[PDB]
Structure formats: C-alpha cells, structure tokens
Design an enzyme around this catalytic site. Sequence first.
Site, PDB file in Angstrom:
ATOM      1  N   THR D  12    -106.849 -49.764  51.577  1.00  0.00           N
ATOM      2  CA  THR D  12    -107.502 -50.720  52.458  1.00  0.00           C
ATOM      3  C   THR D  12    -108.256 -50.289  53.712  1.00  0.00           C
ATOM      4  O   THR D  12    -109.187 -51.040  54.133  1.00  0.00           O
ATOM      5  CB  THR D  12    -106.477 -51.887  52.859  1.00  0.00           C
ATOM      6  OG1 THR D  12    -105.367 -51.831  51.886  1.00  0.00           O
ATOM      7  CG2 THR D  12    -107.157 -53.257  52.940  1.00  0.00           C
ATOM      8  N   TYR D  26    -107.349 -57.658  50.271  1.00  0.00           N
ATOM      9  CA  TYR D  26    -106.989 -56.209  50.238  1.00  0.00           C
ATOM     10  C   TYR D  26    -107.696 -55.719  48.946  1.00  0.00           C
ATOM     11  O   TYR D  26    -107.240 -55.924  47.810  1.00  0.00           O
ATOM     12  CB  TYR D  26    -105.554 -55.943  50.353  1.00  0.00           C
ATOM     13  CG  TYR D  26    -104.276 -56.271  50.979  1.00  0.00           C
ATOM     14  CD1 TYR D  26    -103.746 -57.555  50.795  1.00  0.00           C
ATOM     15  CD2 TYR D  26    -103.440 -55.379  51.694  1.00  0.00           C
ATOM     16  CE1 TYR D  26    -102.506 -57.948  51.297  1.00  0.00           C
ATOM     17  CE2 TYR D  26    -102.174 -55.718  52.186  1.00  0.00           C
ATOM     18  CZ  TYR D  26    -101.702 -57.011  51.968  1.00  0.00           C
ATOM     19  OH  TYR D  26    -100.479 -57.518  52.341  1.00  0.00           O
ATOM     20  N   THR D  92    -100.919 -49.480  51.430  1.00  0.00           N
ATOM     21  CA  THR D  92     -99.571 -49.811  51.921  1.00  0.00           C
ATOM     22  C   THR D  92     -98.575 -50.103  50.842  1.00  0.00           C
ATOM     23  O   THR D  92     -97.352 -49.744  51.049  1.00  0.00           O
ATOM     24  CB  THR D  92     -99.684 -50.887  53.040  1.00  0.00           C
ATOM     25  OG1 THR D  92    -100.450 -51.953  52.428  1.00  0.00           O
ATOM     26  CG2 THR D  92    -100.339 -50.383  54.334  1.00  0.00           C
ATOM     27  N   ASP D  93     -98.904 -50.675  49.715  1.00  0.00           N
ATOM     28  CA  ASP D  93     -97.989 -51.072  48.658  1.00  0.00           C
ATOM     29  C   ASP D  93     -96.943 -50.090  48.147  1.00  0.00           C
ATOM     30  O   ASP D  93     -95.823 -50.576  47.943  1.00  0.00           O
ATOM     31  CB  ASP D  93     -98.911 -51.459  47.519  1.00  0.00           C
ATOM     32  CG  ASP D  93     -99.486 -52.837  47.580  1.00  0.00           C
ATOM     33  OD1 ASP D  93     -99.606 -53.643  48.504  1.00  0.00           O
ATOM     34  OD2 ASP D  93    -100.022 -53.111  46.483  1.00  0.00           O
ATOM     35  N   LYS D 165     -91.788 -51.431  52.755  1.00  0.00           N
ATOM     36  CA  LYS D 165     -92.593 -52.658  52.940  1.00  0.00           C
ATOM     37  C   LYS D 165     -91.642 -53.831  52.934  1.00  0.00           C
ATOM     38  O   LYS D 165     -91.066 -54.243  51.891  1.00  0.00           O
ATOM     39  CB  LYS D 165     -93.784 -52.582  52.012  1.00  0.00           C
ATOM     40  CG  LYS D 165     -94.848 -53.337  52.878  1.00  0.00           C
ATOM     41  CD  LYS D 165     -96.049 -53.230  51.929  1.00  0.00           C
ATOM     42  CE  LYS D 165     -96.880 -54.489  51.853  1.00  0.00           C
ATOM     43  NZ  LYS D 165     -98.190 -54.029  51.342  1.00  0.00           N
ATOM     44  N   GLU D 288     -68.218 -52.050  42.238  1.00  0.00           N
ATOM     45  CA  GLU D 288     -68.523 -53.203  41.357  1.00  0.00           C
ATOM     46  C   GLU D 288     -68.682 -52.858  39.899  1.00  0.00           C
ATOM     47  O   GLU D 288     -68.846 -53.758  39.030  1.00  0.00           O
ATOM     48  CB  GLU D 288     -69.718 -53.879  41.969  1.00  0.00           C
ATOM     49  CG  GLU D 288     -70.088 -55.292  41.791  1.00  0.00           C
ATOM     50  CD  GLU D 288     -69.522 -56.374  42.616  1.00  0.00           C
ATOM     51  OE1 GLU D 288     -68.511 -57.001  42.363  1.00  0.00           O
ATOM     52  OE2 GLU D 288     -70.285 -56.630  43.575  1.00  0.00           O
TER      53      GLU D 288
END
Lengths: 331, 331, 331, 331
Positions: D12, D26, D92-93, D165, D288
């Site tokens: 971007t 974007y 950014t992703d 993110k 768990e």
Amino acid sequence: KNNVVIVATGGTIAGAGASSTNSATYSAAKVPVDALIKAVPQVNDLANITGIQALQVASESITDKELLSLARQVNDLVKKPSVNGVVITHGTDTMEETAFFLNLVVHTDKPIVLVGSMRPSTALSADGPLNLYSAVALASSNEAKNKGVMVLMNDSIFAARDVTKGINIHTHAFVSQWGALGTLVEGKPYWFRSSVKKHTNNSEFNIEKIQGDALPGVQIVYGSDNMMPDAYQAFAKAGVKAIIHAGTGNGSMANYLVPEVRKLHDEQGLQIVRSSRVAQGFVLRNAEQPDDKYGWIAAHDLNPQKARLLMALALTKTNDAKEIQNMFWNY
Amino acid sequence: KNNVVIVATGGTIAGAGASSTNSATYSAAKVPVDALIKAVPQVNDLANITGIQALQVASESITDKELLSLARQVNDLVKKPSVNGVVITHGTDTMEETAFFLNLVVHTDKPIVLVGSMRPSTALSADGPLNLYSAVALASSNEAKNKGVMVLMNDSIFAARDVTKGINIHTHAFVSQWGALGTLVEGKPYWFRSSVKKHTNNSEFNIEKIQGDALPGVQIVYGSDNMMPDAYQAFAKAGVKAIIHAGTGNGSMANYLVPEVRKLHDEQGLQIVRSSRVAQGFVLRNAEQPDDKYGWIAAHDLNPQKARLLMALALTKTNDAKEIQNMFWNY
Amino acid sequence: KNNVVIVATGGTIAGAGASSTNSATYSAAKVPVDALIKAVPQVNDLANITGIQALQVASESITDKELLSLARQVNDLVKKPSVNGVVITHGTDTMEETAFFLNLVVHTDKPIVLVGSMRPSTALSADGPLNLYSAVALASSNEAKNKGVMVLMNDSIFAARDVTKGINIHTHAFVSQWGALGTLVEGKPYWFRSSVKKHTNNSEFNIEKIQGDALPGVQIVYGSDNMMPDAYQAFAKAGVKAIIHAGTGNGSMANYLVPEVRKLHDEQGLQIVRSSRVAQGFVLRNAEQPDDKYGWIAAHDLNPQKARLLMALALTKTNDAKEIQNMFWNY
Amino acid sequence: KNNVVIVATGGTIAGAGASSTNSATYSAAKVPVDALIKAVPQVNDLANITGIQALQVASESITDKELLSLARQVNDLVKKPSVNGVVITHGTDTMEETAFFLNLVVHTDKPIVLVGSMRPSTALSADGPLNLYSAVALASSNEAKNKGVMVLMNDSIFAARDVTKGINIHTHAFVSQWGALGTLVEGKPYWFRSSVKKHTNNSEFNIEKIQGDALPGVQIVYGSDNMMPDAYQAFAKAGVKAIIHAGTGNGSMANYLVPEVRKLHDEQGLQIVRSSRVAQGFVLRNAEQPDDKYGWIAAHDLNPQKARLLMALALTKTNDAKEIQNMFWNY
C-alpha cells in the site's frame, strides 16, 4: 524448597472486613500473616514459609516512614543466605508505589514480589489465595533473579517500574503499557520480556545510605482546565523541595501558571517535574514547555505518584536539574 | 449537502507552529478556520461549509469563561434552521472537557463533533485532514442526531461522556472504557452502541439558563501516598464550593486526612466528591469511605477533570449532596 | 424474588475434573446443575432457583444439534409466565457461539445470560461462584429486559453479538471491541451502552420456525500466506452451501485462489463470506475484493465462528447474496 | 549517516491504487522503491539511502518462494560492511509473517525493520511517510542492534515474534500482548523492554543452510463448533507434513475429531500442532489434550500463521515432536 519469607503489610487479603459476597467492601486492618499462611496451606508445598508482620496498615495511608521501614526490613531480610526470595502482601491502591521504591533502593538480585487481592478474603471467588500461592512459586523460583522487583496479580508477573492500577472493581486491575515480564501458571513462571532500566543492584539509590524517617518534600499538583496557583503556593510555603505537575496531555502547563510556577522555581528554589494525567506514552522534554529555558524536568513515562518517589529519592543525592532529568530517563 | 459550521477554537490542526517532521512540537495559536477549510478542500464535497473563529486558544489553558462562551456560540449556532451540524476544532489536551460540558448544557438533537489532531498541521503523516474531513461527514450526516456530543479521532466516533486522552504521542490517543459509539470510514458512519445516559435535550443543565462568566469554584486535589492537607486548606480558604478528591484506587482517602477533609466539609461547608486516579471501573458509593455518614459524593466513572465540571454545573442548581449524587449516577 | 432458571450445559464450573490448585486442567463432564446450585447457595438469596440439565457436553464439541436443542429448551422455558429470567452454564470456549445463536433465534424480552468459569470448580481462587451468583442477580433483575442475550464474566455484562474469548489463562478472557453493556457489582447491575443491532424480538430468525436437527452446511477456511485450495475443494465436494473465508487483514483472498474460489461459487453454487483473522475493526464490502463483481459477502465485524452461524441461519431464509449481505450489516 | 537499504516488497505505501480520500482502497502493485524514496525525501537527512526492488507483490499473496527469496536478499545485503541497517516496505496483512521468518533464519546483529502503511499513499492523512522516515531513523540507529527483527508502525518499535495485525481500518492496527520494545519519536528511539527469546545470531535456523524454493508442507485448519474432518483429510492426502490446529480456546480439539486427527498422525505420520484462535495467553502443553499421550505439540503463544512458519522451518531439521516442542518454547 527455598525459603521465601512472606512479609505482611496489611491489605484486603491479609485482612478482610465485611463481605462474604463481593468486592466492594475493601476493609483491611484484619488478618495477620499467619492467619493467611494458614488459610492457603498449599503455599507450604512450594517452599519453606516464614511470615513477618512488617506493618498492619491500609494501603492508601502509607507514608514515607512506612516506606523507609518496609524497605529496611526487606533489605535486612534479603541480605541473609537463608532468605531465597521475599513475597510482600500489600493493599492494591498504593502497591505500585512500594514496588517502585524497593525497585529503587534495595540492592539485591533475589526475587521481591508484591502480591495483593482485589476482593476481601471473604467475597465469593476471592483472588488472594491463587495469588499468594502463585506469588510464592516465583519468589521460590530459581530463575526469578535480576528481574528487578515484580508484582504478581491475575497470574501476571509485572515489572515494578510501570505496573499500575488501571481498573477498579475487577480482579485484573493491574496493567502496564510495556506489558508484563511474563505469566505464572500452575506453579511455573513463563518469561517473554525484560526491563531495559536500572533497578536493584544497578541503582544509584540505597536504603542502607538513607538515614532519616522521611525523604525531602515532593508533592503532586493535578492538571485540568480552570486551575489556580493555590496548591503550588500552599506547598512552596510549606517547604516542599519540588512539585510534580500532573500536567494535562504531554506535561502541559496553563499559560496563567507558567508565570507563577516559574517564580516558585526561580525565587523560592522549587524543583519542577512536568508529568501527566494521561497514563500511557510519555512526556517528551522540551516539547510542550521549554525545560531547558526554565530549568524544569520531563518525567518521561512515570505516573505522578511514581515520579513523586523518584524526585524524593533524587533530591537525596542532587539539586542539579540535568542529573535528575538523567534519572527520569533511566529507571 | 447540509450546512455544517466549522467552529475553530485553536489547537494543533487549526494551528501548527514548528515541525515539518513529527508530533512533539505541539505549538498552536497559528492557523485560523479558513486557513484550515482551504487546506482540506475536500471537506466542501461533503457539505456547505462556513468557518467561525470562536476563540484562538491553546487547549490546556481554557477556563470556564472560554467554556461558557464556546457553549453559547454553539447554542446560538445550533438553534438555526440552516445549521444542520456543527464541527469543533479543538486542542487535544482538554477536548474531553469541552465535549463533556456541551454534552451537558447544549439543548439540541443535531450533531456536535469535536475533532482534533495529535501532530502539528506540518508533521509528516499529519492526522488533522482525514479527521476534519471525516468529522465533517458525520456533522453533515442525516443519522448523527441524538447521539449526544461526539468526538471523532482516528476514524472513531466517541461519546463525549467517557472519551479521554489515554495515550501521548500516538495518533490514537483517544480511548474509552465503554468504547466508541462507532467508526467513520470513507465518508460513511458505522454504529454499534448508544449511551444510556442523559445528554443534550434530556439534561437538567442549560447555558441559556446560566448567566455568569464563571461557575462556582470546584477544584481537584490528587491522591498518592504521603499526602498533606495543604491544597484542601488552600482551596477552602480561597472559597471553592467543592473539592474533587482524585483518590487512589476506589476513591480512597488517607486516614490522616479524613479528620481534616471532614471538617472542611462540616465547618466551612465544602462539598466532597470522591473520584479516582484509576481511569477505568468506577467509584462505588459507601465502599471505601461512608459517604452517607460523612455527607460525601461517589463520582461513579467520571475522571477528575470531568467530575470537576459536573460539580461546577451541579452547584448551580443544588447544594443537596443526594440530588447531586443523583446526577453522577446519570450523565 | 423472580424465578431464574439455571440451565446447565456442562463446562468447567458445572464440572471440574482435576486441579485443587490452578486453571490449566479444564476438564468438565463433571458437576450437574444441582451439584452447582448447592455449592453457591447464596444464589438462593437472589431468587427462586430451578436447575435444568439441558446437555452435559464440553464446550468445544457442541454441534448444531446441541445448539438447536438448547435454543428450543431456552425458547420453551422463556415462554412461561413463571420464568422471569434464564442463566446458562456454559464452557468458555464456544460460549460466544451459543449466545450469538440464541441472540438470534430466541424471540423474548427476558434476560438470557450465559455464564462460565476460566478455572475448574476446584482451583484456588475459582471464578465460577462469584460469576453464577452475579449471573443470577441480573437474570432476576427487573431491568435486564431487551438487552438481547448477555454474557456475564468477571463482573462484566457483555452483549452476545460481539463478546469473544480474547485471552487464555486469565479469569478475564472475555473481551469486546465495542465494549461491555455494563458491569454487575455486589448484586447490582450498572448500564452504560446499548447495542444498536437486531436481536431477540426484532429478528428475522426463529427456532420455532426452524425444524431440522441441523442447519445448512457452512464451514470456515483460515487465511495465511502459502495457502492451498484443498479445504475449499474438500468442503464443496462434501456439500457445504457456503465457505467463510477467514481472510488475512481486511477479508483478503490470495490471487492464486480467487480463480479457484470464484469457480466454487460460479459453478458449484457455493456462497462466499469474506471475514477475517483480525479480531477488531471490520471487513468493508467492495474494499479488498469486488464482492459486487464476484457475488460475495462482506461479513462486517463478525469473527469467523460467528459469521459461520449467521450464514447457516441466513441460508434457511434466502440464497440471495444482497439480502444476506443485508443481515451482516444488521446483527 | 549510516547506509540503510530500503528493500521494497510492494504493499500500500510503495503502491497506492485508488483513494485520494481514505483507507479502504488498499490496492498496491503500484509505486516502486524510488517512487517512494523520492516522495519522503527527508529520509535522506537520516542516512545514505539505497532502494532495492526485491518483489512487487501484494502482501496476502506471498508464498514460501517469496519468503525464501526476500530472506536471501536480506541475508546477502546484511553481510556487507556497508549495509548498516535494512528497512523493508511490506503490505500490512502478512507483515507479521515475513518479520517472524527473517527473525528466525537471518543470522545478523544489524537492524532489520519491516515498515508498512494502513492507508493508500494517496488517502488524506496517509501514514506511510512518517513511518518510512521513522523506520529509517532506527535502521540507521547505532543502538538498534540485537533487538531481533522489528516492526515499526504508529511510532511503535515492535519485536517480530509477537507483533500482529489486531485492528482493521485504523492506522494503529499493530498490537502485541507482551508489548512493544519501545517507541520512535521525532527521530529518536526510546527502549523499555527486550525479548527473552532466540532470534537472529542465536537461532538454529538459517536461509544460508536452506536450499529449496519451498519448505515442507504445513497448513492451518481453523476451530469452531460444528467442524468436519474434511480439511485434515484433504491436506494429509495432499502430502502436508503437519497441520496447525487453530483450536478454539486453549488448543481445543472436538471429541468427534480426536479419533480422526489421531489416525492422521499415527498412520499417515502427520505432525499435530495445537494452537488457537484466541490471540492472547498461550496454549499450555498437556492441558486440554494429552500431547504426551498423543505425540502432539503445544504451540505456546504463536498465532496460527506464525506457528505455521516455525513448524515448516522445524521439519527442515527434525521429525522429533519433543525437540520441536522445544522450539515452540524458545522463539
């Protein structure tokens, strides 16, 4: 099977005075150190326990005398080959304050943990026990050395320098902006970060070197819109050495007070530390007031209370505004 | 194509005085309302714009006179059939304060948005523009009515009652514990929550009914360990009507001051609002001090600054501690 | 003295299977509804209690059959003049999921509270009790109506639509980005916000209208870098009606899959909901992939799990991508 | 006046393809490295700049080939006496992903900074510039060595190991639970914490030792209620070496799949890493599901994407479940 000493100062856990239902009735004075040790008997599986009743105060009412006296006791205790680690039971309100102080003046590598409770020992789902026990697993931990002083609330291991009371009814009232050093779950400590500041063995200050029963007068004035110079004036006139200005935003001083606050520093020799009311981020020197021009100090990221303590300790060693400015950048 | 009026009060956006690089040089006084409107000309695609220069102050230095005067102007403006919505350019430091005030005394259903900037209009990646434009898209929004007063920072739509400056260098300095009413992205508003409090048309208070150029004296004393009664005493002696006690933890008063603070209320008729230094959660009445016994008020979840304003407005209508306690529970 | 019914589904509180020390041993199956009611007997001071054992599952393993069956029971219970409010004991893992579902298909104005515990009923400082009791004070609250469905964890009252498990060992594991509707302290509820979404009485969906023992196949594919079309292909070939794409960032699809995912929708008629792996903010339609061009849906601010349920319920009423897109904008 | 090399990967900032107004559009592919360097010319006052166009991809679509190829270039660049520091422009992703990878396989002490932008280079108030410039001040910083790899978004210096993110439209989309190493304001870096993990020079892994153009198949299956074994089965059958199970809560597996997932590991030799969909806290081994019994791995505090990369790198050195479990505890 290390010897952790539990040092009781009072506070809601080692004292519950009302509610068998919930939080709100924070009324201490009540349950001395053994009353406690004997209530979370699992703590004994963690280590060899020994409880000292250092004070039996309510957190909010601690003064410098109580600070200097707990510091000295925790210093005496920490010098012994048989004390492996120490746990302090403390009221949550001013816990932040005692851990900053000891963080500062105690020269040791051994684990110093302040532990507390947001619910009376008697409320349903009381937090104290799991915190006392857990506080214990770290103070007895072989890998808890040179972390500085730590707070242990809601399984979180916090560094004393930045841990503060950010929430009010919840068991998870203790936050930090730089975060927790780590978490303690089911007896075991988990590490992620380390402070990059000066504490314990690498710290100018020392209770061994401090002899009064008080530190020099440092007091806090809170910022908001429509302020008056009356508190400054009251405090100068009372003979405080510095004022921590809980400035709005980035350390901000109202243009109606700079005139006033300048003279209180210029004339009556008051020191002026510009801090904020904003909990996160920090007060940049020379930014929103010219410290250099004015002879003031940028308290970086210390909240008012904490800045209060550094300055009191600062003025035990210098009067020099740059060397102090230098400690606000290091601790 | 609604007529939004942009009302300039000063602050870092409608005034940048240093840095073509970054944040820190927050120095206003500088760029009046048109200088602004003409710099974010896209704002004109959103609506019919008209800029009023209400004041040209720096946020931190606002007083009650500036509050009462912006309130009146925003009240006069909001009564006109041609004003659809209003946007206020404000310094970030005390923004929280003006939006609480107008939230309170302005009787209107139309969108009242306080918008600001954390970087000088000249720093690289300046936040102002996208905020002025976005602030505008809401004030011109047909579905922005009866939200109360709102702050608009970092695409977030905040309710005036709880929005405060929680961070200091970052563009996202404005937080809330109950959160944002919603977000504004690419011209459009997105809603999620609504306040359950009293504001604007359903509010006891009114600038139309308030006539001075000042409100009754209400002033803040900050809590920490090792405190002195000097500020209280200075403020009583100066003739303030109430003290907001920025208590440690849950509204906490040091047992060395209850004696003192009690007389200042009992004898000299001072009002006492117990708030905190803790930003989140709220101060429960009767909890950590018996208000009922003592005649005090639990300021619920208002930070000191904000509690300060409710009390000043409170004592314009009553002196009755329960009816006021009642407003702290509603706003 | 309202009749709240406690409906036990299993989960760590109404079942603790290991630790008398801490958290980690989350092993349910264990303590049916009375075993519970009889352990927090204070709950009886709050109201008239009646415990129903609806299932005795472990949270993570719930399917649509268990959902449709708890929904129906909570629907039958809620239609009676004598049921004032209902409390559901639920495992924390998938609690978020059941409250979204009931939020959706139960047509009632009465308080529906899902309550849980992050520590086994037997760990030191177990959270369950104070939560069961507190959960109860709201379900019996006279002012808990038309809030939608709520979660009650760590004294917080959460709206079902956005409450999710954000933290993993701590008692305060339940967060929201729009925040909590309010807090419940010492028996009393405190309100601050209200949802602006459609729930309970104002909701297209209804378990009364739903008759299977399953909903149409909707399944989640998770985004990361270096992905393969194998899960999509496996799920189409299995006969699922839609895929929720847990896209990286803003709903992002890898350019190596758009080709693939497009055909799976174009050819085999698969529905495609673009959600994210990012917990906060929302996926803007037409933004990072042209939904309009492609016939896809922007799941707004629903996390994958939750989007999963809306779509399953969506395809019970339409196949029309815009009308569904319309529900993602409303709930 | 150090030589920082800016290495453009797309994203971007070093590519804006729509909006001169806001965020949402974007659309990269667009502005190569010089187009950039020449747009934030202040960057040149910070150091000697040199721009390399390593790829011109869109973040979400990066594969192992792009990772292995950027790693090698950043390794070649970092071995030169004249490269003082390196800055990477990234979408950014999946930024989080590349910084984890390089964090891991690059053996160097010099500053490796991944920088990005949440708004197209053309939106009003675009974040890129102040981030590129600031990213630069650190990579050229003389005190940026041995921090590991860092992300630099919204003046924050983040450690690669935990930065992700967390928010979607806002300029402050990058969070961490252990927090930021520090902040960069007005050219200067400010430090607070340091990682306690293994990175760069003290890391088993190395791109110099890795020779393919791909790593062994590791793929993610997402947890929710009503799941199917179809993705596992599709991935085994495709020949992936391990599955990262994005378990609900604390690494949770649905009792209808343990049967299935067990065989896929027992029979077809699949590795099984139990991670979560919960962003904070960590997955405790043996908690768990009994890993020990089953031969599985507790991915501690790595989010699925990141766990994905450790495992791919893990299976380049061992097949031994305990030695790998050991890396999840260290990185």
